[PDB]
Amino acid sequence: GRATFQFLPDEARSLPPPKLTDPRLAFVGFLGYCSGLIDNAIRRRPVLLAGLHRQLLYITSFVFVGYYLLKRQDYMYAVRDHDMFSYIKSHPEDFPEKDKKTYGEVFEEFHPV
Amino acid sequence: RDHWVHVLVPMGFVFGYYLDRKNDEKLTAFRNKSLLYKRELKPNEEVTW
Amino acid sequence: WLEAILPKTISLAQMKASTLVTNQKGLIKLYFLSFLITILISMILFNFHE
Amino acid sequence: RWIARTFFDGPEKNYERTMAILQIEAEKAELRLKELEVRRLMRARGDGPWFHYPTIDKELIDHSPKATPDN
Amino acid sequence: PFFDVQKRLGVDLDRWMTIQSAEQPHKIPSRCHAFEKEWIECAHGIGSIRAEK
Amino acid sequence: MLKYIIPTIMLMPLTWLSKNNMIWVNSTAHSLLISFTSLLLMNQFGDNSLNFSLLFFSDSLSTPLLILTMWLLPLMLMASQHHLSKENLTRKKLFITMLISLQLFLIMTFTAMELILFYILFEATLVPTLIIITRWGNQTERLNAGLYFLFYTLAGSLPLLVALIYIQNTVGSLNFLMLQYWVQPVHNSWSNVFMWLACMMAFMVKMPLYGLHLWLPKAHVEAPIAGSMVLAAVLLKLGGYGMLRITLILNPMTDFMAYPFIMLSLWGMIMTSSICLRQTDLKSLIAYSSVSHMALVIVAILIQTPWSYMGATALMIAHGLTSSMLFCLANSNYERIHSRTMILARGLQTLLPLMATWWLLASLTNLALPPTINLIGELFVVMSTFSWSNITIILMGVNMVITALYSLYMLIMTQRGKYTYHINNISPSFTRENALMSLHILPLLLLTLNPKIILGPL
């Protein structure tokens, strides 16, 4: 939002943050873990397990980045909400309180076969 | 070696069956219902939730 | 008569992709005269000025 | 008798676990009816900072006494 | 997408030539000058979508 | 739940990770085991159906239907083994992966908790199936079966996503079936027909009406080795059940236009079975059964008034097996003699005596002898669809005649003297021939003992 052209502002301090062992961060770089295995296979490596120095440094990269990016995503869905309630709260004229009533009241159609 | 390939995989089950137990703590929010459905006085509702 | 009606769609279109390629071949004059029809015909036609 | 208590549970869960996750729901049909009663239809007000647009910046205007008595 | 860097940091790229009344180096006006400072005064805190109406 | 997707995805690197030829037996061993998990927490209620998570109720619904879906997987590697042993292992590792890659979504679907996980997973196949048809075909006509299999299935299932995104923002949230507790009806307009027609016709193009089935024998006649994915594509089709989740509700009260789907498929049911009598190619002959007494469900579903769902459910899994197993016979008898032309194989029943009783019990369950599931799945159809109007007894009474001449003519064609020129056909059905051909008739008839486990809620 504000403080434009910021990856994330200072206001993101109050969020959990999204720490590890979430399926995605594991999954993130999994799709890289199936990426590394490709990286060999295109050139006729022909290892299918080749040097672990290429077969790693991917997995290191994704989950770091996948992580460092999920920190702001969760933020954004918070500032979305935040700006909603605070508008929903004021202008109560645009937000009615519905009454309570159902049975002994409503008729439906009523069309059986 | 010891063949990690083999039945080590079925252990995925209890791996998963635990995850179905991770939620029940956040689905607790109703201990109150009229259908018995009690969670009344007992140390039963207290377990499993 | 089930296969005439629907695969008629096949040999319907695949012909109209012979009128959008064959008849457009060449002659840099021939495009350019036709941007002009298009740039006027947008004046008279519709909302475009309204 | 041996199996039912060995594996699964009764209407202390698969009943009144639905009670549980239908308050994870009927608050998701409250907040998809108030977007479309706000977002789509704001409207003519352009009131809330949504359909808001740029206009002009009155900071860059000048108040000084420029030279010509009438302007 | 309109980034508007010249807002964040300090420089002025253009922003001066922009409108009919800003400076005019020796302070000489335009003909319709006096109606700018009138019309900009109108729509500023506006969000321009109600400005038209 | 994750009890299932996780081991079955855990299967995925149980295969390549292994050594040389141990691969087949490696995964066939485990793939059976999951069936204990399959029943394990399932076959709970019953009443007030099971929903164990936010976005999954695995199957409660009384549409159990999922236990079969987990059968047919380690029936493939016993099925598919024949001529797939002739190319490379890194490709053979593939064909077991995508085949699983199918099995993973059919567990996701049938649960789905909702409409909009269904669809994206309802269209989420055709990536794995289309790749099995085009590669590992036999004839060169396969390349067209690739297209026709799309351009229908996908052709009209896009109008779903125009409609289901139209409901999501109209009434509340479709996020959950288990909340329909507010549903208004659909009265009439020239708009609502389309809504009902958009929310329907995508399903019909799978379980065929007598129109727009033009693809079904195109893909089956020419299709992979064992019927390897042809057993699976006889699961896929019947899985159009979801019309049971909709048409029960979500425009309940338009039956007004039902009639062009009744009289159109009700006169085809007496029809396409009859265009099946002179067929000269055997894997065609079975492909037209599959239309016929499948297309009877479409007159079971549209009519409301259970005693149809009593009988409509038993049918989805009725031929679910019988119509499966026949594609398993006609495969085997094709291994030995390389024509699929029905004429050519005659003078069997002397030379393969044990496989005699295999044809019979198969061709006997299209006849539907009274005790098995088949009739007790048809005679709840006729009992309600009679009350609709008395005259339905005639056509669907004719169906019960032409289908009997239909089946026998397939068996009795293999009782004749023919010695003729064949020096082939020596193998006396090595066990897999008769092993994988079992695990059908044993489990099939069996259910008739306690057949309350196949039924709807009604």
Add this chain to the structure above:
Amino acid sequence: NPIIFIIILLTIMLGTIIVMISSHWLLVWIGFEMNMLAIIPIMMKNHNPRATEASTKYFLTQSTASMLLMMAVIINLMFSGQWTVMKLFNPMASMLMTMALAMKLGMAPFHFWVPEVTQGIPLSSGLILLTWQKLAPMSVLYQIFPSINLNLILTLSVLSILIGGWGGLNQTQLRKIMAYSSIAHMGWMTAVLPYNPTMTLLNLIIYIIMTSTMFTMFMANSTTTTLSLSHTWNKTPIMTVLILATLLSMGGLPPLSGFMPKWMIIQEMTKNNSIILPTFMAITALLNLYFYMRLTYSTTLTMFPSTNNMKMKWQFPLMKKMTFLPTMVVLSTMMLPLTPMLSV
């Protein structure tokens, strides 16, 4: 020679950075006036009798394309006499903006060009740079966004995604097949544009990636369709599972990410209760798929390996960042309800 090629190839984006950064109508002239000045030598490099009968059919087709704009800038210098960048205050401006700006993007008409250039530029290397010129103009249309006659920007759209669709079914050269169906994806993003103009960019990024990762794959030697047959039995089969893991995803099927723009876009274009528009778009991108099928029946069907062709050598091209993209061009669907709230 080799230094300047990084001076030129830098000045391009400097030509398009003054476009996105500016307040001032003059600069968005100068801004993409110096592309048509700084693009031209790239076409040349091998000095052949096509590029030079190409970039001259390009030149004068981006010369007027610009030079009309300067006529529709100076109209509203009359009326209101305030430059900057906002609705155009007068209808002869906009209608002379948007339908003379469709020349750089080319939309439904104004393409007898995109196939006449992209074909037969001798330089196929790239030609990935014709993904910039999609990105300069849009960074006007996002600003001017609340002035359009609204009966037009659809009428160039819906006559486009159709006309670019049928264009290729008849094509063999696979530089054209990308040329076509790159008018197509200009049908989705400017059909949306008056309704909620983000969820356009969403289709704009997902597009810059997918067409990007094609070319980098089409670079080893690959040129004509029947030189993609001699591919799997020669170069490497791990290449073929790739070219089948994208070309399918690019028309799109829901388990991939190519389905991600549509799936979101129609959330937008209904909810505005236009449901008779999107089917016809939704349904027409269908026969936009039948290029790719029948392209993909070239490489997996083992079609007559070329001849005795023995390539025993390994490769030394630059695959740069190809070892990433078709893990982000495919698998991203499972990830994101971000794209509507991330770039916004």
Add this chain to the structure above:
Amino acid sequence: HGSPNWLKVGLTLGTSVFLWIYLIKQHNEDVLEYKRRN
């Protein structure tokens, strides 16, 4: 005497030693910020 570059090898390792360090350096810091702010 395996012959990688032995120039860059270990950079990628060393670099990750920075990132995870710097990552948690931002994380273990920011965690308290929520409470310090709330």
Add this chain to the structure above:
Amino acid sequence: AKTVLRQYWDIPEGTECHRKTYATTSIGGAAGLVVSAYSVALKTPTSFLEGVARTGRYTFTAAAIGAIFGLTSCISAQVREKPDDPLNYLIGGCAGGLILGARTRSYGIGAAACAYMGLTAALVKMGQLEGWQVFAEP
């Protein structure tokens, strides 16, 4: 502009069949022209100055069809009953197959024109009749 079409509509939908059809018949021809004229920019020629007239010979139509479609409803309109029903304002479409058939050869169009240009007529009326919008905003 919105003009002509709008004018006709806010004219004699179910009644005053004359002005309407005379309009719908003249507008069809007008539209027909446009395409004929366009055919000279993208397609060339070879029959000299008079040639374009010769070319138009093939476009010697559109107008006819327009006329006919209006005519069908013009003749109908208040006919047997309200031709305002969804199935009815259809009728103007199919005669179209016959029209094209007459224009050129047989068996390979006249049905399709009657068919598809039949199918897409009703929707128009059916469209505003339920209040459908093709181009909208929130």
Add this chain to the structure above:
Amino acid sequence: SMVYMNIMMAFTVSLVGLLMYRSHLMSSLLCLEGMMLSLFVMAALTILNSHFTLASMMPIILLVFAACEAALGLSLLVMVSNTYGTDYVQNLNLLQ
């Protein structure tokens, strides 16, 4: 007043058949390099009759490219008629 309808009818100099055609390309390229002065003069009045005092440089910047760039695209027209000797728009070779 009137001087704004001339010159405007002049700025339909575009006329496009005579913008790409017919041959002697140099006639086409010509009416382009004089499409300016319809852009210039027209914008050398509205700037002038009212005193903007600031945009007054803009007229200068409307040439400095209009000469710079249009003088580029002349270059190609050597490469075409170097290999030929006649420009003659009638060269189509690259086709579609």
